[PDB]
């Protein structure tokens, strides 16, 4: 009755869960389209909304619920299972129904998250340009000790061109690319010098608005696997600082090829949480 997405076992979050670390007491903010708070396979603890006319606990798109599900779908006897099922999950709505947002909305969600003591911030969104405010916001958060993860882009590769977007491209943020069930790079995955790590993003099944489950493709599906891995590491080593968790993700990743296409490689959380 409970499904275990191929993604969980691939990054070895399952081996870590078995030792008893599931992310309990770790606070994760999901900056997205909101989350369908009423889904039986999710436990949303609070949040804020920076989008006019929509509250933070509804998702009229589905993208946000899906991401939330990869980080934390409940460990129970139904639906799916998240990377860090026991985390404290906040939904910060920065994107609208159609899936897009304004830089000031985003900057507001990023600062909300710093002021409210989030340990991990997930951003499965990106644009061609950043801003000085966006840059300030991510530098300070990370300087204040939060772990910031973003999706690199579903821009693919084209020549020697860098197709990573903002805020992934900022060096205070972990840019995440996507792989398939065979650990092969998905065709859509952005490339460039700022690519840091790879995670599952092709054919990812997760929670979906109106109490169901669905399969989606993207770096948006990949990023959450890393936010969640960050949270596992912290439930195991509370003592760690942000750049210590980060450096653990990249140092112990599985080598898959050139860094321009794969960063340091596929994440392995068992190795990282050593």
Is residue 59 flagged as an active site residue?
no
Residues 6+ apart with CB under 8 A from 247: none
Q: Would the annotation count 17 as a binding residue? A: no
Beta strands 204-208 and 174-179: pairing type? Answer: unpaired
- Which residue shows structure tokens 């509370």? 238
Q: 57 a known binding residue?
A: no
Q: Which residues form the interface with Ca ion (CB under 5 A)?
A: 41, 73-74, 76, 79, 173, 175, 194
Handedness of CA 21, 113, 122, 207 (dihedral sign): positive
Name the active-site residue from 39, 59, 63, 86: 63
120 appears as a binding residue in the annotation: no
Q: Which tokens in the block code for residue 217? A: 């493709």
63 part of the active site: yes
Residue whose tokens read 């460990």: 75
Whether 119 is catalytic is: no
Pick between residue 51 and residue 198 the one whose CB is nearest to Ca ion.
198
125 is annotated as contributing to ligand binding: no
DSSP letters, 170-209, are STTSEEEEEE-TTSPBPTT---STT--EEEE-SSEEEEET
Cα dist from 150 to 17, 40, 55, 124, 177, whole Å: 24, 26, 23, 6, 9
Cβ count near 158 (within 10 Å): 8
231 is in an annotated binding site: no
Minimum distance from residue 77 beta carbon to Ca ion (Å): 7
- Residue 269 in contact with residue 234, Cβ under 8 Å? no
- Catalytic residue chosen out of the listed positions 88, 108, 220, 223: 220
Report how far residue 236's alpha carbon sits from residue 269's, in angstroms, rounded to the nearest whole number: 11
Q: Is 256 annotated as a binding residue?
A: no
The H or E element spanning position 72 is: helix 63-72
Considering the complex, state which of residue 247 and residue 274 has its C-beta at the smaller distance from Ca ion.
247
Instruction: Name which of 73 and 110 has its Cβ closer to Ca ion.
Output: 73
- Catalytic residue ranges: 32, 63, 220
Binding-site annotation, residues: 2, 41, 74, 76, 78, 80, 168, 170, 173
Binding-site annotation, residues for Ca(2+): 2, 41, 74, 76, 78, 80, 168, 170, 173
């Amino acid at each position: 009755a409970q499904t275990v997405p191929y993604g969980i076992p691939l990054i070895k979050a399952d081996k870590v869960q078995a030792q008893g670390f599931k992310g309990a007491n770790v606070k994760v903010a999901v900056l997205d389209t909101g989350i369908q708070a009423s889904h039986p396979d999710l436990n949303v603890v609070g949040g804020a909304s920076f989008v006019a006319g929509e509250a933070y606990n509804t998702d009229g798109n589905g993208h946000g619920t899906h991401v939330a599900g990869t980080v934390a779908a409940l460990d129970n006897t139904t639906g799916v299972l998240g990377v860090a099922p026991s985390v404290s999950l906040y939904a910060v709505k920065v994107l609208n129904s159609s899936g897009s947002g304004s830089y000031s909305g985003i900057v507001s969600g990023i600062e909300w998250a710093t002021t409210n003591g989030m340990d991990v911030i997930n951003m499965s969104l990106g644009g061609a340009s950043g801003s000085t405010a966006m840059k300030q916001a991510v530098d300070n958060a990370y300087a204040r000790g939060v772990v910031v993860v973003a999706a690199a882009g579903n821009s693919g590769n084209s020549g020697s061109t860098n197709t990573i977007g903002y805020p992934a491209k900022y060096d205070s943020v972990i840019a995440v690319g996507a792989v398939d069930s065979n650990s092969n790079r998905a065709s859509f995955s952005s490339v460039g010098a700022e690519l840091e790590v790879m995670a599952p993003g092709a054919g990812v099944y997760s929670t979906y608005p109106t109490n169901t489950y669905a399969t989606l493709n993207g770096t948006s599906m990949a990023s959450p696997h890393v936010a969640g891995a960050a949270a596992l590491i912290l439930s195991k080593h509370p003592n760690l600082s942000a750049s210590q968790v980060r450096n653990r993700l990249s140092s112990t990743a599985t080598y898959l090829g050139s860094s321009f296409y794969y960063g340091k490689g596929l994440i392995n959380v068992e190795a990282a949480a050593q």
